[PDB]
């Protein structure tokens, strides 16, 4: 999904709000902040109601301006709440009644997702690959900066995981795939407009194809 969450390479932001080794304060800065992750895990591990992938996608589905003005941990409150409503566990009524006011949720999905691809290639360390030039309206773990770009394989994972584009929508056809550390030259991604060396993206097999 080509959402505003796909931030890498966006220009116009100011300084990162940190200097190295500065005090970051406590893990949680407010008494509710442990709730989003805890309740995510309740949903995943205890209820079996959704995957972590579905959490990532439901946050991507926040209305874009809402996403942009919402602090991090609040986005996951919104996202977990949304999934609990969508899965029929909770109602928005009861959430707003208990909150004592408005509790807007992420927007409905506009895609049913897609299955794990049936045709993929097992790549080897040192191989050259291209990121498939595809557009996925639902969830995908491919930042747009690397779409259609060429890099080289630095690692093939020894484990395999469900294809995000499927389980992120709660589908039954996510299969399993390894992922690959794909090393791109900075100039491949941003031309002359970068001060970097290389960028390594951890890409599902189904996002990749052999380079020409």
């Amino acid at each position: 999904m080509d959402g505003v969450h796909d931030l890498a390479g966006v220009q116009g932001f100011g300084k990162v709000p940190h200097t190295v080794n500065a005090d970051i304060g406590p893990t949680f800065h407010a008494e509710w902040e442990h709730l989003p992750y805890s309740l995510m895990f309740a949903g995943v591990a205890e209820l079996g109601a959704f995957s972590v992938d579905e959490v990532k996608y439901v946050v991507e589905r926040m209305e874009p301006r809402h996403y942009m003005m919402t602090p991090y941990y609040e986005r996951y409150v919104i996202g977990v709440a949304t999934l609990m409503v969508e899965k029929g566990i909770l109602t928005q009524d009861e959430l707003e009644s208990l909150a004592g006011g408005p509790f807007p949720l992420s927007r409905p999905s506009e895609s049913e997702g897609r299955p794990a691809p049936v045709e993929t290639t097992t790549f080897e360390v040192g191989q050259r690959v291209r990121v498939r030039d595809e557009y996925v309206p639902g969830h995908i773990r491919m930042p747009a900066y690397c779409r259609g770009r060429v890099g080289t394989i630095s690692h093939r994972t020894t484990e395999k995981w469900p294809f995000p584009d499927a389980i992120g929508h709660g589908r039954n056809d996510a299969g399993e795939e390894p992922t690959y550390h794909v090393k791109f030259a900075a100039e491949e991604l941003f031309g002359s407009d970068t001060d970097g060396g290389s960028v390594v993206v951890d890409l599902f097999e189904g996002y990749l194809e052999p380079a020409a």
Partner: protein, 197 residues
């Protein structure tokens, strides 16, 4: 035009979500409190620091950490949620590694701790993949011009830690002494370990 939606205070929303679930019997007793404790007390960059210090003082373990990071971490019992498949990335005299999650916040929680606010910022997520040298400079870390910067974007299940170079002036230090200078920011990659005078 472009206005924020009306929202109840975030604390009220967050506790409403808890209460709605808990009042249906969906949240075990002590569940969120247990996670709170894990996140605050167990998941910690002191663990990654221990790992770095061991690698610095034990060539065999270094090799293991760089080849099968998951197995290395498991020896210490530090695998966990968001830290199941570990890759350690080695800094060298010509290479500085830095980690981000441009899409969200993904971080090797058990060994780095939960990410700090700045790591999750839009500024870091947008900028470090494109201009890491300037980002690190602004943060207080000057990377000599003879060093390639490599940014790892944590886009799948690999969870990364940086193995920084060991600074001069630490020769013969104990593992405890070395661990003290390997900070959270060293593990993320935005800082280089510092030796006092």
């Amino acid at each position: 035009e472009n206005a924020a939606p009306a929202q109840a205070p975030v604390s009220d929303r967050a506790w409403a979500l808890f209460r709605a679930l808990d009042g249906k019997g969906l949240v075990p007793d002590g569940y969120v409190e247990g996670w709170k404790k894990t996140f605050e007390e167990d998941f910690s960059p002191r663990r990654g620091a221990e790992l770095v210090a061991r690698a610095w003082t034990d060539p065999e373990f270094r090799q293991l950490l760089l080849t099968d990071g998951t197995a290395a971490v498991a020896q210490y019992g530090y695998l966990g949620p968001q830290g199941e498949y570990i890759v350690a990335v080695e800094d060298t005299p010509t290479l500085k590694n830095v980690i981000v999650c441009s899409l969200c916040s993904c971080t090797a929680w058990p060994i780095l701790g939960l990410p700090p606010t700045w790591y999750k910022s839009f500024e870091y997520r947008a900028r470090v993949v494109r201009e890491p040298r300037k980002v690190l400079s602004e943060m207080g870390t000057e990377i000599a011009s003879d060093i390639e910067i490599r940014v790892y974007d944590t886009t799948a299940e690999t969870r990364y830690m940086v193995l920084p170079q060991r600074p001069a002036g630490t020769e013969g230090w104990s593992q405890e002494q070395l661990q003290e200078i390997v900070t959270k920011d060293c593990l993320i990659g935005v800082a280089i370990p510092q030796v006092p005078t």
